[PDB]
C-alpha cells in the first residue's frame, strides 16, 4: 500500500503547496517548496514572481533540462518573461531567440518579431529629439522597421509600426 | 598532495581510478597536470 511516513508526507506537502498558492505564503512557499524538492515547477516559477526576496533564474534552469528530442511547454513561457522583464543588454536576448528558432524549425518567430519592435519604439523617440541630426539613426530605424515587417509577413501591428516611423 | 587543474574554472581537483575524467565543480573534459615539488637541476647559462 502507501508508504509509511514518506508517501503520506509527500501527498500532504503537495496539498499544503496548493494551499500556499491559493493564499500567498511567501514563507510557506519557500519552506514548502524546499520540502517538496525531496516534470512540473510552474508553482515554483509562480512563487518566485508572486513573492520576491529577481524571479528570472529558476525558469531558465527548468527550460534548460530535457531539451534533446504543441512545441515545448517549459520554454514558450521563458521567452515571454524576458521581453516583459526588459520592458542588461537586449540584443543578446534577440540572439538567443534566433538560436532557439534555428534549433527548432505560437511559433517563437512571432515573439522574436515582437521583441525587435520594442527596440524600434525606443529608437523612434530618441531619434525624434533635437538634443538636430539628418542621417544615422533615421536610416538605422528605417532598416529595423523593414526587418520587423519581413518577419511578421512570413493589421494592428503594422499600423503601429507606421505611426512609430512617422514620429521618429 | 596529488593535483590536476581544470582547464576552464582553474580548480585544483585530483581524481583516482574508476572515476569520470571531468572536473567536479564544472563540466569540463580537459585537465592540466599540475607541477609538484620535484628537483630539476639547471646550469645558470
Amino acid at each position: 500500500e502507501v508508504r509509511n511516513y514518506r508517501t503520506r508526507h509527500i501527498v500532504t506537502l503537495t496539498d499544503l503547496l496548493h494551499l500556499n498558492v491559493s493564499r500567498h505564503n511567501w514563507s510557506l512557499a519557500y519552506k514548502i517548496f524546499a520540502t517538496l524538492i525531496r516534470s512540473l515547477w510552474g508553482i515554483g516559477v509562480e512563487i518566485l514572481d508572486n513573492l520576491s526576496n529577481g524571479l528570472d533564474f529558476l525558469q531558465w534552469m527548468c527550460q534548460i533540462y530535457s531539451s534533446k528530442s504543441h512545441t515545448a511547454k517549459f520554454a514558450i513561457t521563458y521567452l515571454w518573461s524576458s521581453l516583459i522583464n526588459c520592458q542588461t543588454e537586449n540584443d543578446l536576448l534577440q540572439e538567443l531567440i534566433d538560436k532557439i528558432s534555428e534549433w527548432v524549425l505560437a511559433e517563437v518567430w512571432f515573439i522574436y518579431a515582437s521583441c525587435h519592435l520594442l527596440k524600434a519604439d525606443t529608437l523612434s523617440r530618441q531619434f525624434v529629439n533635437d538634443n538636430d541630426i539628418k542621417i544615422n539613426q533615421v536610416i538605422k530605424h528605417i532598416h529595423y522597421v523593414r526587418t520587423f515587417l519581413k518577419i511578421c509577413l512570413d493589421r494592428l501591428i503594422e499600423n503601429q509600426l507606421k505611426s512609430f516611423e512617422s514620429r521618429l | 598532495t596529488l593535483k590536476y587543474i581544470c582547464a576552464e574554472c582553474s580548480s585544483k581537483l585530483s581524481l583516482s581510478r574508476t572515476d569520470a575524467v571531468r572536473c567536479k565543480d564544472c563540466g569540463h573534459r580537459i585537465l592540466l597536470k599540475a607541477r609538484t615539488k620535484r628537483l630539476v637541476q639547471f646550469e645558470a647559462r
Binding site: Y30, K31, A34, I37, G44, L48, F57, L58, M61, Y65 | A20, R22, K24, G27
Partner: peptide
Amino acid sequence: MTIDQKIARRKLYKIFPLDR
C-alpha cells in the same frame, strides 16, 4: 535560511554527472 532554487540546480547538475 533557505537554499533556494540554487539547490535544485546543483542537484540536477550532479545527476547529469554520476551520483551516489
